[PDB]
């Protein structure tokens, strides 16, 4: 839940 | 040299250079003639220049080939088939299900009162009624619902909208009597609220019981820079945004991403703050019947920051249920009393040291349904939540990845079943004593597929060190291993991302039309088998990844599935990383590489949108000792000499504009490679899309390109 493509 | 040559003019600046510490050469220079491209599509000419070029190149390639429109027209021939989630139960006593009838772009919220269920999803179409029509907000349908979350009132509904060639979004609020109507005109959102919320980049969103306002994370008033400065406001509806009331802003930290989460029953409040991309938080616990809603609020530690992550799971009073990897890397389920906060977590569920906890969630008031991962593939396991005793598995028989809906309050779960060859089940499950009531509510069918001409197998390869690697190998019963076939083979390897049986329509027709076989390995990086498999293919590991990946594909051949002219590879974002550099370090090995918004330049990522979270996972180039080990495999600084590698047909699809990976990568690495092989002979092509999503119409228009240039690269022939 941070961000990762 | 080649037919479609030259390639388009891409400008260089000769003299541009960044200095970076080596523990190895104290320091070392790294010359970017395509620095300039960097500077965003909108801020830019030269950047224009490019994209428009490099467009228009890559177009007429893909468009000259019969087998572009062939594929089109039968990807959207079979892609017509109705699409649904699990019924999903809310506060105003209806089913919320997703819907799609075909080739709409987006998915429709339809609804159906509890009790009245067995309605929809019937020959007749969705039944319910339709509650939110993404097409309708925009007449390109490119607007997105990027999520939503209903009032514990069951009044209110808040859902998170993007615009086309964005990726921030507003949030607004509709009453749940103000449905979308099938008959509204395009281009307008009608029976919405006055309530808006601009500047958000997530979709975090939290109801006070009250039902009276939310939390959200926010970011300051609006290209390419670090994203800078989360913020967690409180909205009231009917205000306007100026009013909302401010809850947390770190200002010494302004890369940290924060949000809150409410327990179910909106009582405590848990902030977590992500410094970076690994499975750790700082984080915090307030007691809102204890407290005013603002920056004076009591907060408690509920654990030293950075060791682990915590999501609330349920209550029941001051106690709170929490998934956790706190001393449980494969995580573990833990309880927390609010009322003896220095007693800190309980143990409810231990840690499997053999299986990844994906989720854990309560239904029939008592009953812990946890979801495993073992052998690349999910198992549910249901607790008793008070003692935490076994109480059997469900689903056993079945082999693939679950969607679980249902409260804690309802003893029905919908569970949403899919796999390589499974396009999703969706089943009932009713909680009793001692067993419970399964039956199968609805199955998705593709008119013009027969599922049973295909099979998955399970393999397992040695990777270089001699890790033996789990694959899975998705193809027609009746092609023969007799070592002519071509292989579409799909990588990640990071981030704790597990590559899962998931059902692609697409690719089964790869495998039919291309008498082809479709390659899974589950590389490290993946959580596939615990999280120590991330940890070796990560920072100085990361080689390894690549390693298992170039392994596959030796095995594919060696074993005869595979032709070795006929390795075509397909990787996006940090899959991007393994494509890039497994085609650099071995394109001897591969036919074709599909690279989709890909993460290439491996010292530069830091500096752009959400890049700098990435260093938990590649390192810091910027530390004199991860710069080592990163520029060994940094591809964009690893492309080899042109005098004796001949490198494979590469296919790069991107974006103009792309918060998540910044398009600077793709850009870069296709002029470099073009530069470096000026004369192919395969072709390095960039596939760009004017507005960044995701409608249908793009996806298989994007697949049409992807398949077309694979068959061309490859030398393979359409059947019929």
Redesign the interface.
Same mark, same amino acid.
């Given at each position: 839940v941070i961000v990762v493509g | 040299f080649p037919g479609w040559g030259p390639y388009p003019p891409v400008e260089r600046d000769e003299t541009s250079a960044i200095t970076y510490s080596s523990k190895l050469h104290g320091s070392v220079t790294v010359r970017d003639p395509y620095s300039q491209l960097e500077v965003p599509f909108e801020d830019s000419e030269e950047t224009k220049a490019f994209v428009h070029s490099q467009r228009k190149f890559a177009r007429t390639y893909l468009d000259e080939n019969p087998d572009r429109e062939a594929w089109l027209e039968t990807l959207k021939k079979s892609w017509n088939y109705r699409r649904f989630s699990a019924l999903k139960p809310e506060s105003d006593g209806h089913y919320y299900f997703e819907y799609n009838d075909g080739l709409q772009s987006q998915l429709s919220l339809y609804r159906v009162r509890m009790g009245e269920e067995d309605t929809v999803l019937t020959e007749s179409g969705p039944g319910g009624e339709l509650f939110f029509n993404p097409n309708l907000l925009s007449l390109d349908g490119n607007a997105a619902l990027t999520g939503f979350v209903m009032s514990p009132c069951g009044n209110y509904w808040a859902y998170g909208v993007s615009e086309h060639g964005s990726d921030w979004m507003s949030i607004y609020v509709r009453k749940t009597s103000s449905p979308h109507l099938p008959s509204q005109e395009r281009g307008k959102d009608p029976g919405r609220m006055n309530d808006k919320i601009r500047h958000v980049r997530?979709f &975090?969103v939290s109801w006070t019981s009250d039902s009276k306002g939310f939390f959200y994370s926010r970011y300051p008033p609006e290209g390419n820079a670090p994203?800078m400065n989360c913020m967690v406001y409180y909205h009231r509806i009917g205000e306007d945004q100026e009013s909302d009331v401010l809850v947390h802003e770190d200002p010494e930290h302004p890369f940290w &991403?924060s949000?809150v989460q409410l327990t179910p029953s909106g009582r405590y409040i848990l902030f977590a703050a992500?410094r970076?991309?690994s499975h750790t938080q700082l984080v915090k616990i307030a007691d809102l019947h204890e407290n005013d809603i603002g920056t004076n609020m009591k907060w408690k530690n509920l654990h030293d920051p950075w060791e682990a992550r915590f999501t609330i799971v349920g209550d029941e009073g001051s106690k709170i249920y929490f998934m956790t990897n706190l001393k449980a890397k494969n995580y573990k389920v833990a309880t927390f009393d609010a009322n003896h906060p220095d007693e800190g977590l309980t143990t409810l569920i231990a840690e499997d040291p053999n299986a990844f906890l994906v989720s854990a969630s309560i239904h029939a008031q008592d009953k812990l349904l946890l979801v495993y991962l073992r052998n690349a593939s999910h198992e549910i396991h249901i607790r008793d939540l008070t003692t935490g005793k076994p109480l059997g598995r469900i689903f056993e028989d079945l082999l693939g990845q679950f969607m679980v809906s249902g409260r804690r309050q309802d003893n029905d779960i919908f569970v949403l079943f899919s796999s390589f060859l499974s396009p999703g089940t969706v089943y009932r499950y009713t909680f009793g004593e001692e067993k419970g009531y399964r039956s199968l509510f609805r199955a998705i069918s593709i008119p013009g597929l027969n599922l049973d001409d295909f099979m998955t197998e399970s393999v397992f390869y040695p990777s270089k060190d001699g890790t033996s690697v789990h694959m899975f190998i998705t193809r027609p019963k009746d092609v023969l291993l007799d070592g002519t076939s071509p292989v579409l083979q799909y990588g990640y390897g990071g981030?704790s991302?597990a590559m899962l049986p998931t059902f692609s329509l697409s690719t089964l027709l790869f495998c039919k039309i291309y008498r082809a076989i479709y390659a899974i390995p589950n590389i490290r990086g993946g959580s596939e088998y615990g999280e120590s498999w991330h940890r070796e293919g990560m920072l100085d590991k990361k080689q390894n990844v690549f390693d298992d990946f170039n392994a596959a594909t030796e095995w594919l051949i060696a074993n005869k599935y595979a032709s070795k002219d006929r390795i075509a590879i397909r990787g996006?974002?940090?899959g991007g990383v393994l494509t890039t550099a497994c085609a650099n370090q071995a394109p001897g090995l591969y036919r074709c590489v599909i690279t989709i918004?890909g &993460?290439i330049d491996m010292l530069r990522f830091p500096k752009f949108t959400?890049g700098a979270?990435?260093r938990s996972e590649y390192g810091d180039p910027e530390d004199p000792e991860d710069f080592d080990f990163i520029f060994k495999y940094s591809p964009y600084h690893n492309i080899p000499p042109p005098g004796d590698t001949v490198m494979p047909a590469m296919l790069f699809f991107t974006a103009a504009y792309d918060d998540?990976?910044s398009p600077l990568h793709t850009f870069k690495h296709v002029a470099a490679l073009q530069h470096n092989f000026p004369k192919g002979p395969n072709p390095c092509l960039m596939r760009i899309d004017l507005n960044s999503g995701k409608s249908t119409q793009e996806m298989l228009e994007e697949t049409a390109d992807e398949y077309s240039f694979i068959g061309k690269s490859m030398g393979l022939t359409m059947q019929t």
């Open positions: - | 997530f &975090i994203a &991403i949000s992500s970076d991309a981030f991302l996006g974002a940090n918004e &993460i959400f979270s990435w998540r990976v």
